Amino acid sequence: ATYAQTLQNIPETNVTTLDNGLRVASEESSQPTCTVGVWIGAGSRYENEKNNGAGYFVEHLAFKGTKKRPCAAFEKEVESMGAHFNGYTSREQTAFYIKALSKDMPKVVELLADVVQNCALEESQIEKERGVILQELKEMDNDMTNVTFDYLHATAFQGTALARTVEGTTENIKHLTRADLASYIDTHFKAPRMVLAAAGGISHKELVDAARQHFSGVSFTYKEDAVPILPRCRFTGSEIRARDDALPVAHVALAVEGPGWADPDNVVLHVANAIIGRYDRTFGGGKHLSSRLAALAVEHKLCHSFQTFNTSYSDTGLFGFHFVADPLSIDDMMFCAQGEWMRLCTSTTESEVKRAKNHLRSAMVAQLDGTTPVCETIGSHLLNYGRRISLEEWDSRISAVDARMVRDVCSKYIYDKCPALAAVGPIEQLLDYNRIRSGMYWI
């Protein structure tokens, strides 16, 4: 029963829209258990300077209870049905979802609706979470990788909204008002911008009837039905070096502006990132690993790890790589890294893309390893790509990619481009933007 076929067999993802704008979608499996959630098209990018951190503060309350069912009432009801509720909030995408028995499919939707709509926002709890978020910041600040990507955005998108952290400023957390969290919810958590997605043993029809029932938003004026278009974020070849010779290792991330969800090149970009891949000191492969960079990394003890990435966004994106190294091998590593990038633009081989494509498909499949991940793909696809994109399609697109294509596309986005750099730790060895800028050409 060849791969090809198993692909065209996976049940189609159904989507139906309500009069309020809400879009309900789902992929039905025989699974006795399931996952359902609302993927809102909101994040820190929608926040401005005065409320940076709202969507995150709000994330901390969508679970402390609603108007109808207060704290214990909510938790008790949810804990007692063996369900798992949890979510997240990115720069331009927020999500809240539950993992429950396909049986409870309809009661969950009710619960979801009650959260996005009737958050209690108990002004008593607010002051508590305020101290919690402040505490999580102290912690997240010790996560070099995070510090490094935030900074990456901080300078690559300096001057724009995309250059803000999701968690927000220490001041905003200390001062946001119930009212602020209030309007945040009112302004963003809106039907035409939300997506009720589900995966598992669930009837799409049953799913949508339940949606109609509690997700009964009303829309009178045109304004309400409209989805705002965010102001464009300006990428800037720049660098931010936060140095502290006291930290054990050093983090380095370099990137170029990426196209954005909609753009087909992304496929090619992924196939490329698939060649250089990623590495880490516990990869059994060793000196024989296929990725030259990885291989080089191993042969020269160049880094405790490295990883490529193609972080997409609506209108923009970040295509780069990140590596952790010892103070004294930062240069050799950076050198080799740009080396492979230049190689991508100038000499990618068919054999490489062949391996890359296979590896990619495999990752593509792992993206749908369970109701939750599958669900996450739906919520995001609709939200980002507008519709759903089947593995059969992705797989198609991927197959079209070839060396020539990789080189052209990579040259297009990499060659002779002013990159964005972020470095943290004992970064004295790696140095000079110029020296790095010249690494952008010839290979």
Partner 1 sequence: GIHFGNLARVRHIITYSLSPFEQRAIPNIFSDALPNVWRRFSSQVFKVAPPFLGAYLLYSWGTQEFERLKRKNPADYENDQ
Q: Which of 59, 167, 239, 340 is catalytic?
A: 59
Q: Give the closest residue to 50 by CA, choosing from 204, 165, 168.
A: 168
Provide the minimum distance between the beta carbon of 331 and partner 1 in the complex, in angstroms, as a whole number. 7
Amino acid at 14: N
DSSP state of 162: G
Interface with partner 1, residue 328, by CB under 8 A: yes
- Output the six-digit token pair for 298: 């191993």
78 versus 420: smaller Cβ distance to partner 1 = 420
The three-class DSSP label of residue 196 is: strand
140 sits near partner 1 (criterion: CB under 8 A) = no
Residue 306 φ/ψ, nearest 5 degrees: -155, 160
Binding mask 404-443 for partner 1 (x = CB under 8 A): --------------xx--------xx-x-xx--x------
CA 294 to each of CA 19, 272, 291, 319: distance values in angstroms, whole numbers, following the listed order: 52, 15, 5, 18
**Cα–Cα distance measured from residue 416 to residue 410, given in angstroms and rounded to the nearest whole number:** 11
The only residue of 81, 230, 242, 295 in contact with partner 1, by rule CB under 8 A: 242
Nearer to partner 1, 41 or 419 (CB): 419
CA atoms within 13 A on the CB side of 371: 25
Candidate list 92, 104, 239, 352; residue touching partner 1; CB under 8 A: 239
Q: At what angle are helices 178-188 and 123-140 packed, to 10 degrees?
A: 80
Pick from 70, 87, 201, 237: which binds partner 1 (CB under 8 A)? 237
Residue 199 tokens, joined: 């995966």
Q: Which position among 1, 218, 229, 246 is part of the footprint of partner 1 (CB under 8 A)?
A: 246
Tell me, by CB under 8 A, how many residues bind partner 1: 23
CB of 231 to partner 1, least distance (A): 19
Cβ(339)–Cβ(275) below 8 Å: no
User: Counting contacts by CB under 8 A, is residue 238 touching partner 1?
Assistant: yes
Active site residue 139: no
Exactly one of 70, 87, 260, 327 binds partner 1 (CB under 8 A); that residue is: 327
Give me 65's structure tokens: 């209870």
- Supply the residues annotated as catalytic: 59
Residues engaged in binding partner 1 (CB under 8 A): 155, 236-246, 327-328, 331, 418-419, 428-429, 431, 433-434, 437
